[PDB]
């Protein structure tokens, strides 16, 4: 299988904080749950992250749509990796967005 990590963000809170992350997410990024849970995942961004790709995710989240972007991200120790990020909205039967799920793939290669 393709190596990847997975997270769940709560779309019922205004800033889409993370409520769950797979073990690989913590291992890959170097952050622990104490530093991650309850926070928006944007802490992974840094100097070289392309604001235009970030904008795409921001837009997809506001519209409740899925989106896939390639983003420069940084580990806790400050080292970079290329992240192919797919975000999927999870909707309740009334059509409202409850959760976003994110799949990260380290495509640094
Ligand atoms: C489920 C989910 C997973 C996300 N995963 C990442 C990620 O791995 N790396 C990243 O830079 N941003 C990720 N984001 C994007 C940020 O959390 C945030 O939505 C993005 O930076 C746009 O918002 P902002 O303009 O307010 O920062 C994720 C967002 C969601 C909802």
Residue numbers in the entry: 17 to 125
Anything the authors wrote about it?
Light–oxygen–voltage (LOV) domains are small photosensory flavoprotein modules that allow the conversion of external stimuli (sunlight) into intra­cellular signals responsible for various cell behaviors (e.g. phototropism and chloro­plast relocation). This ability relies on the light-induced formation of a covalent thio­ether adduct between a flavin chromophore and a reactive cysteine from the protein environment, which triggers a cascade of structural changes that result in the activation of a serine/threonine (Ser/Thr) kinase. For example, in the green algae Chlamydomonas reinhardtii (C. reinhardtii or Cr), phot allows the light-dependent regulation of several molecular processes (e.g. phototaxis, sexual differentiation, photoprotection) and control of gene expression. The C. reinhardtii phot protein consists of two successive photosensory protein modules, LOV1 and LOV2 domains, and a Ser/Thr kinase effector domain [Fig. 1(a)].
As expected from the CT characterization, the CrPhot­LOV1 crystals belonged to the P6522 space group. We used the model coordinates of the CT dark-state structure to calculate initial phases and then manually adjusted them with Coot before refining them with Phenix. Overall, the electron density was of excellent quality and enabled us to observe variations in the positions of residue side chains (with an RMSD of 0.189 Å between the dark state at CT and RT). The reactive cysteine (Cys57) exhibited two alternate conformations, as observed at CT, but the variation of the 2Fo − Fc map contour at RT clearly indicated a change in the distribution of each conformation [Figs. 3(a) and 3(b), respectively]. Conformation A, in which the Sγ atom of Cys57 is 3.5 Å from the C4a of FMN, was equally present at RT along with conformation B (i.e. 0.50 and 0.50 for A and B conformations, respectively), in which the Sγ atom of Cys57 is 4.4 Å from the C4a of FMN.
